[PDB]
Amino acid sequence: SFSGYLKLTDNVYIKNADIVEEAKKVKPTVVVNAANVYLKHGGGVAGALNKATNNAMQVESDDYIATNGPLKVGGSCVLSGHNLAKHCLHVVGPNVNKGEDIQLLKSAYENFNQHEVLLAPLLSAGIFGADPIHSLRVCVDTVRTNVYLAVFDKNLYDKLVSSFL
Ligand SMILES: CNc1ncccn1
Numbered sequence: 001s002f003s004g005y006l007k008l009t010d011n012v013y014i015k016n017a018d019i020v021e022e023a024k025k026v027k028p029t030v031v032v033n034a035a036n037v038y039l040k041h042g043g044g045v046a047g048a049l050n051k052a053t054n055n056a057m058q059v060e061s062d063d064y065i066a067t068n069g070p071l072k073v074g075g076s077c078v079l080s081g082h083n084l085a086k087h088c089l090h091v092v093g094p095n096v097n098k099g100e101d102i103q104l105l106k107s108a109y110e111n112f113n114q115h116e117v118l119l120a121p122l123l124s125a126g127i128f129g130a131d132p133i134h135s136l137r138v139c140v141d142t143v144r145t146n147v148y149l150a151v152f153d154k155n156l157y158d159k160l161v162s163s164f165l
Contacts, residue, residue: 002026002119002148008164012140012147016157019045019121019150020052023084028148031085032112032120033057034128035092037070039077044127053082061090073100074107089115096129105135109142117146122160126152136160 005013015022023031034045039061041050050057060079071077076091093108094100108123122139124130132151139147151157 002028005148006161008136008161009140011144012149014136014149014151014157014161016152016154017150018048018152019119020048020084022148022150023049023081023119024052026119027085028081028117028119029086030089030115030118031081031087032118032123033088033090034121034123034126035071035076035090036095037073037075037092039065039071039090045121049084049088052084056080056082057088074104076108076111085119089118091123093123093128093135094130095127096124097127102130102134105130105138106142109139112139112143112147113145115145117148119148119150121150121152125156132156132160133163136164 005015033049041047041058071092073092073094079088081088091108091111094104105124122132122135125132125135
């Protein structure tokens with residue numbers, strides 16, 4: 001199971017790790033993807049997770065969108081975890097770089113509550129443009145299930161831990 005995590009709260013844990021390497025090591029029940037509404041896994045966490053699946057995540061995602069249409073910002077869907085996890089919970093946080101409402105970040109984190117344990121990145125962080133310190137605060141104030149956060153950037157990981165209230 002999960003090793004080397006710093007415990008932030010009763011249910012939130014954090015580690016400086018590449019979520020792809022972490023998923024391959026742990027093979028958790030659920031890995032969270034930082035998805036967009038179209039499930040186009042081009043860059044950031046999504047591009048990295050999809051590349052680790054040899055594009056199988058994108059092929060599955062395109063079939064999901066062809067059948068169901070796009071997700072909502074703040075929404076999610078459960079798909080296969082491929083070689084990374086049992087399932088992948090694709091969660092759409094607001095993309096501040098697209099002018100999306102940062103208030104939807106709490107709705108995005110609420111999706112985590114449907115899973116007893118998850119390996120996840122900080123929603124709306126990275127190329128999504130939100131402040132990762134704010135994302136961590138919404139995470140700890142919204143998620144009640146056990147969430148193991150992987151923060152790729154060491155400098156950001158240190159800043160998140162050192163500034164955690
Ligand atoms: C590419 N891996 C990654 N990216 C962001 C957060 C955690 N892991």
